Swiss-Prot record, chain C:
Organism: Thermus thermophilus (strain ATCC 27634 / DSM 579 / HB8)
Pfam families (alphabetical): ATP-synt_ab (PF00006), ATP-synt_ab_N (PF02874), ATP-synt_VA_C (PF22919)
Protein name (Swiss-Prot/TrEMBL): V-type ATP synthase beta chain
Alphabetized SUPFAM superfamilies for the sequence: C-terminal domain of alpha and beta subunits of F1 ATP synthase, P-loop containing nucleoside triphosphate hydrolases
Biological classification of the source: Bacteria, Thermotogati, Deinococcota, Deinococci, Thermales
Keyword Nucleotide-binding attributed: no
BP term (GO), one: proton motive force-driven plasma membrane ATP synthesis
GO-annotated molecular function: ATP binding; proton-transporting ATP synthase activity, rotational mechanism
Keywords: ATP synthesis, Hydrogen ion transport, Ion transport, Transport
Curated annotation (Swiss-Prot), chain D:
Keyword annotations of the record: ATP synthesis, Hydrogen ion transport, Ion transport, Transport
Job description of the protein: Produces ATP from ADP in the presence of a proton gradient across the membrane.
Protein origin, superkingdom: Bacteria
Species name: Thermus thermophilus (strain ATCC 27634 / DSM 579 / HB8)
Name the record gives this protein: V-type ATP synthase subunit E
Keyword Zinc-finger found: no
A single cellular component GO annotation: proton-transporting two-sector ATPase complex, catalytic domain
GO biological process: proton motive force-driven plasma membrane ATP synthesis
Gene: atpE
Span covered, complete protein: 61 to 188 of 188
Key word Lyase present: no
Assigned protein family: Belongs to the V-ATPase E subunit family.
Gene Ontology terms for molecular function: ATP binding; proton-transporting ATP synthase activity, rotational mechanism; proton-transporting ATPase activity, rotational mechanism
Curated annotation (Swiss-Prot), chain E:
Binding sites annotated in the UniProt record for ATP: G228, P229, F230, G231, A232, G233, K234, S235
Entry protein name: V-type ATP synthase alpha chain
Role: Produces ATP from ADP in the presence of a proton gradient across the membrane. The V-type alpha chain is a catalytic subunit.
Record InterPro entries: ATP-synt_VA_C (IPR055190), ATP-synth_a_Xtn (IPR031686), ATP_synth_asu-like_sf (IPR023366), ATPase_a/bsu_AS (IPR020003), ATPase_F1/V1/A1_a/bsu_N (IPR004100), ATPase_F1/V1/A1_a/bsu_N_sf (IPR036121), ATPase_F1/V1/A1_a/bsu_nucl-bd (IPR000194), ATPase_F1/V1_b/a_C (IPR024034)
Family classification: Belongs to the ATPase alpha/beta chains family.
Pfam families xrefs: ATP-synt_ab (PF00006), ATP-synt_ab_N (PF02874), ATP-synt_ab_Xtn (PF16886), ATP-synt_VA_C (PF22919)
Catalytic activity: ATP + H2O + 4 H(+)(in) = ADP + phosphate + 5 H(+)(out)
CDD domains: ATP-synt_V_A-type_alpha_C (cd18111), ATP-synt_V_A-type_alpha_N (cd18119), V_A-ATPase_A (cd01134)
Source organism of this protein record: Thermus thermophilus (strain ATCC 27634 / DSM 579 / HB8)
GO cellular component, one term: proton-transporting ATP synthase complex
Matches recorded under SUPFAM superfamilies: C-terminal domain of alpha and beta subunits of F1 ATP synthase, N-terminal domain of alpha and beta subunits of F1 ATP synthase, P-loop containing nucleoside triphosphate hydrolases
Sequence intervals crossing the membrane: none
Curated annotation (Swiss-Prot), chain F:
Residues of the full protein shown: 169 to 209 of 223
UniProt function note: Produces ATP from ADP in the presence of a proton gradient across the membrane.
Species annotation: Thermus thermophilus (strain ATCC 27634 / DSM 579 / HB8)
UniProt name for this protein: V-type ATP synthase subunit D
Coiled coil region boundaries: none
Signal peptide: none
Family: Belongs to the V-ATPase D subunit family.
Amino acid sequence: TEALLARYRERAEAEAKAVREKAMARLDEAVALVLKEVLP
Amino acid sequence: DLLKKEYTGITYISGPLLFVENAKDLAYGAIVDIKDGTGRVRGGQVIEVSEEYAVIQVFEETTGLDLATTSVSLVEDVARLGVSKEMLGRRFNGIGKPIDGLPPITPEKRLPITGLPLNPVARRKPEQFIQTGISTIDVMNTLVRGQKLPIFSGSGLPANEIAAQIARQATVRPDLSGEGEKEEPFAVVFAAMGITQRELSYFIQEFERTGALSRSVLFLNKADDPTIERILTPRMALTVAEYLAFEHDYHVLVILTDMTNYCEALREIGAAREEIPGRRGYPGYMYTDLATIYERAGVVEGKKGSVTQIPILSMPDDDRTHPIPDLTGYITEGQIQLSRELHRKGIYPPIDPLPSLSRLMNNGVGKGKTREDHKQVSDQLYSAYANGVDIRKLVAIIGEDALTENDRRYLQFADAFERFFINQGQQNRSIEESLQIAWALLSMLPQGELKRISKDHIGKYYGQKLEEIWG
Amino acid sequence: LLKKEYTGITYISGPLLFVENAKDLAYGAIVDIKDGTGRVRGGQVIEVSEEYAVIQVFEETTGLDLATTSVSLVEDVARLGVSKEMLGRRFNGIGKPIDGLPPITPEKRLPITGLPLNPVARRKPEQFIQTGISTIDVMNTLVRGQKLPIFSGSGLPANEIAAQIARQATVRPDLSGEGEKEEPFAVVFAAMGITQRELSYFIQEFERTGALSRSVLFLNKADDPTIERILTPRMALTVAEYLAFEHDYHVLVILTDMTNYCEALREIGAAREEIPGRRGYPGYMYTDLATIYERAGVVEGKKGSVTQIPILSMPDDDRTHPIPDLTGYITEGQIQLSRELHRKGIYPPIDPLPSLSRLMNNGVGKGKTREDHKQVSDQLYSAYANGVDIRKLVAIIGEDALTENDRRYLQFADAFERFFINQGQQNRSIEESLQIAWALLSMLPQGELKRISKDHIGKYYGQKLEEI
Amino acid sequence: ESAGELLVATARTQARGEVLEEVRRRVREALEALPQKPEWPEVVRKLALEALEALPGAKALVANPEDLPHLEALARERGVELQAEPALRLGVRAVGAEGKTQVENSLLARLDRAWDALSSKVAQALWG
Amino acid sequence: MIQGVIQKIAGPAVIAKGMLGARMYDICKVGEEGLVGEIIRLDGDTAFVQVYEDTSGLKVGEPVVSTGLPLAVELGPGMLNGIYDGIQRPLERIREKTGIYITRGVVVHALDREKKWAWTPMVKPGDEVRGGMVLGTVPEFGFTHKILVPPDVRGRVKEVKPAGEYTVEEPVVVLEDGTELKMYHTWPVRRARPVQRKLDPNTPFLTGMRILDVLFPVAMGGTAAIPGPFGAGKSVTQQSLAKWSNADVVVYVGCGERGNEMTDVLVEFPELTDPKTGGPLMHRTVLIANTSNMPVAAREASIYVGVTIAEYFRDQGFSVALMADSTSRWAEALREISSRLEEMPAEEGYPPYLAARLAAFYERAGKVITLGGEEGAVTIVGAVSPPGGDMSEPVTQSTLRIVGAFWRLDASLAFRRHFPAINWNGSYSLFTSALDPWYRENVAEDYPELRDAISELLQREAGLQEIVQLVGPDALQDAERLVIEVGRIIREDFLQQNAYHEVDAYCSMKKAYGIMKMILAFYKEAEAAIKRGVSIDEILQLPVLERIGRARYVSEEEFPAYFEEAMKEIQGAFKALA
Amino acid sequence: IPGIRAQIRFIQQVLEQREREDTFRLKRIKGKIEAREAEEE
Ligand SMILES: Nc1ncnc2c1ncn2[C@@H]1O[C@H](COP(=O)(O)OP(=O)(O)OP(=O)(O)O)[C@@H](O)[C@H]1O
Ligand SMILES: [Mg+2]
């Protein structure tokens, strides 16, 4: 049935939101770290 | 490392080759970008370096390249591929770039694509019997884990279907071996060199049906794709397979769809380079080049992973003496050779057992591995089938009326063999079923003619009739 | 009218010499090589470059040197002078007379390679040529504009059949239905690698019947320079095209021993150091032979035609040899001679079964021969093939086991061989050949003639072999 | 039955790609803003020196017209001619004696040349 | 543009000096008369030019101008009902400009410029337009020719012309960026035209020939090779395919073949009817003619031009059949040009990239979703002319690795005048299993089973032939004799087909099914009778066999009644024997 | 006997062709080395 597909879509979107927030947590820190790394 | 050095001053562009003069800082074997006037970037590899110029083999068509606005720049000194465990479930093209629209992968290591030889001291002896579900392979041409067992196909023979079926049905038999009972599956690396859309469509559809695209890495070089990109595809595939196997304890099955196309690409480059050919124009180093690919399979002491290769090649005119099959057979550990005669009769898989062979078979069969009667049963089957073929040749010149009773029993055995052992369609036969069929067939012969089977085995398995299985 | 000479010869090896300052020598230009002795021999530019120009010399380079030799330009493209007065003459393959008569005055100078015929300009070959040979005229009809070769062997009478067809070939306008007035008919005869004996034979055969009066003969000997052989077909076809498409002639061109032509082509190519093909023959042999054979045809808006009958000898009787193989790929059928019929003493020894005329269907029937031609040809083919199959079936069960129908078919096959094929030097007319065919068919029952409409069977069946 | 697993894996892969692309875009926007900072002359000097020592026997050094003033002395001490090239930005370029070899140090080249190697570090920092 | 001067002339190869800046595979005009050629090597200041025209009479130092553009074709209304050369020059225009002979240097536009086309817009101002969409339509010959956006063009529409009569050059739509979209566009012939996605062939390519359409089918987007020695029937087979196939458009490509064949096509097709649309046959045919004695290097251009035009009509949503008259001549052209390059040769002197070029050409076949979203297909049938009939040769073997069907013509069958002369033992097709559903839903539920039965009977007869010849026809058993005679019937009643007969030239799938069912019914009844004790001779003397003989000659409209009558008669005649 | 004769002739032809190709290659390479010595020494 399509209920399983709907549940899979819901959980996929929830995981996408969770990973996006987890990135938001330290995006700027990662950018600063990579900038420092590239420079000598 | 962090800077871009650009080499204008290209002096030559002909066929697959490009000459650039002042490139004395390019390493032998390095990878370069060729940028034309319009801004398109094309790849290439350095295959000769000197103070005069550098020979570059291009990986794409040379249309639009000019000697005034074209430039060459370095990417890296050694051709490496970014490798991550997250490559499973991804589809890459011949040079290993994604073609499924998903973002490029984040590497964990960058390993050279050529690789390195496996130390003989480090190697482990392949001994794990793999059940393919095909009687001719399982009983008479056993495949072990850590083997290079190619398929010798023809122009219109169904080798692709056999490869798909082997991938679908493959499994170890932990119960029969005595080791730990685990149901871990195979991770399938699939390298297509110059594949047509029909064959690629079949393979993709079959894998999607079986749900194996999740644990498979695909390196696809199609028929419309550039010909010189085929040099890199098998090496990228084997780099990924070795990584997975000997760093993440996967059992990898690698399929190389058409090695004839690879050899043709090699010939194109070698002819461009004026290499002294071997037979039929193929370069003299083709044996070494093929061994650099095939020998990247096996098992290593102290590790749980393995690599198994099932290359598929088409014999040009059904000729086993052609250089490609000849060198492959001198390198690999056996071969499964299809037969057009059996194909015309409708037998599937159309595998002729007499030209087929499995070198490592004796390491994966016998007491404690599959069953005690296995080896002698296979030997007896070969003997009887050979007798039957000879008697067919005899009838072709003398006529059935002159045949003695034993000769007719052997002919009937050969026909029944072809129709009930070789011919199985799409059916997963356990080694036990295959042995049972072999025994029912050998029961068509008098007790005493089974000189290769020990008396105790004859007592324990001889006598059952073929009707007990069907009808 | 002034001439420019080049003294900058820097290399001579084999048939090539190099000229240093020959920038104005065109590619494909014909040249004259004059040595210190004053002898002038010709050549051709085969490659040209700023550093030097390569010249292929028609003859041996004996007596040439780098100090006195000079090279001069004759014409940019090899041309030939053609006049209607050529009828009744003989030439050597370069155009020079060899009959002891004064040279002709040309009305035009035509390039000998010729331009390709545009497909849009051609028209379908739709009229037949009465060759006088029953097998060809019934089973393998020759159609005006066709290019139908004869495949012969080492000892088979190719020359005899060529001479007989040239002597006997006609156009038969009466059967056209409209009764059109007689149309001109010539015969251009290209001979290549012909020995002295064969040249004498052909001169005699063309003088005996006065056919020479309507023919142009280009004869090339086996001791002549090799390149002369290359030009012979092109000179012949240039004359043929001129006659056909500027004087409304129906020229039949017979090219004899094209095997010798291919041997010469291989010699020249190997001299030019080219990559060889199947059996040493140049990889471009197919294109070179097409440049000859594709000059036959009929054009829309012209009343003339060019028909070609190449004649070949298959080495080792091998039909898979490059020469017959490439010729078959170009031509519109094949007439094949058989050694069995020759060992049987049958002339002409044409075997109907492996022979074929691709254009025959469109040049036989109402207004062209008569309405029974195609059905009779197909029925003869069926009957003779069936007879041969039964004959090979007799190598198993023996004569005693054959049925009545098998006996009838074997008898028909034998009588067919004895009468329809074996005609000696008779000039059988189309009507005569059809009558012989109908008489031979009448041996078989009226019901077995499955391929002939009942009307034609009724009209022509029943006549016996009373005419002998 | 594997459709859900495939969909989830694809979603995770594309989300990670989106985060990485956002990081790369931010680093691009930052690098293009480097010239305005007061330390830009030091960056120009160091890049020019790296290019010069990476192209022995260089004939001339090409830089942005607004940037050559910061390179007036460096070129003279090294004995290499300077040229004005508006197209090049936030970078320096060198041309060899032969005139057929050149070296480019534009920060975009460095970014897009080292990104593949730094991708592992970015991944382990973001999702360590 | 880039201007140079000839430095060296050798055959069809010209080396030009002072061409620095010229790109690979870019057209140029060689000599004072502007002979067209393509660049295939760059060395220093020099460019190696292969010329698509005769080079006799050229001199060193003559000008050589590069056009900056690769080899392209003009795609637009005007190609149907037309005959072109290798590089897409109208041969009717060439004739009426220069007479009955072909002279080098003629400059003519492929698409007529003085013809007015009835044009109907379908794009409004301000609509976003992307590569492959249909801007409008024009009637051509009963086809609704669709004016396409060039594949690599995206933009927004500013102005659209109104309905009316326009020539090809008329800008019928202008984009917001200024790009002018006309009734035609150019396309490089060495680049495949893009598509949205490729599909799985699931519909037959109906050829009208029973042996090919039954035993060795080909799908609508499939590939077929038909090798055979000379005199086997390649050209007749391809003409019959062009005459009776169910393709909307046919593109016939004569490479290095006879000119009488193109003349035959032109003379005949204008007085033949389209199978489906009912109009003249030529209106669905495109002819690309580079005969044997035309310039050799033009054969490659002919192949590429044909495939590109076929791709174009596919992009208009048609089903297109491409017939390559001789790919062997294209291989010969490659061999000659490589000899002039001094490249190291692979087998038999062919260049080592021959297989790659053949593969690229054949891979343009397939059923696809077009950039405009419609469904299209290109079916390529490729003739091969092996030297001496040897099938172990490079072109044939390199073709056998990419084609889905292999129609093997046999000299032995062709000499006994058994046509189509297809060796059914050495032929194969890989679309048999994919097309079974279509057969079941469009011919009969049991069609595959009967087809398999007939194949099995043919195999059994082939087996029995060896013993028959070795031992004698009479010495065999009786049921074996039935097998032999039924195989004879199958060959000479079902496999044979006269391409010149008015009715037999074409055969519907239902007609083939009917003949097959009649033969099989006869065979089953004869087997029963032999069991019952009936003698062979009695069976063979039955008059119904004659009715099975004339079945293929029965018209299609009359054939179902003939089939019912014969089916009744087989039973009626074989029951009274007792 | 005629069949075996045909097979023998075919095989002999193929071997002669391979020999001719080898000779052509050897000539090409010998000319290459000779030209190298003559031009660039
Ligand atoms: N189906 C057919 N029905 C009747 N006649 C046929 C048929 N096929 C071939 N033929 C006969 O065979 C002759 C040769 O056939 P065709 O021109 O097709 O040869 P081909 O195989 O293309 O050979 P080539 O390479 O010489 O062109 C035709 O002119 C016709 O006489
Ligand atoms: Mg043909």
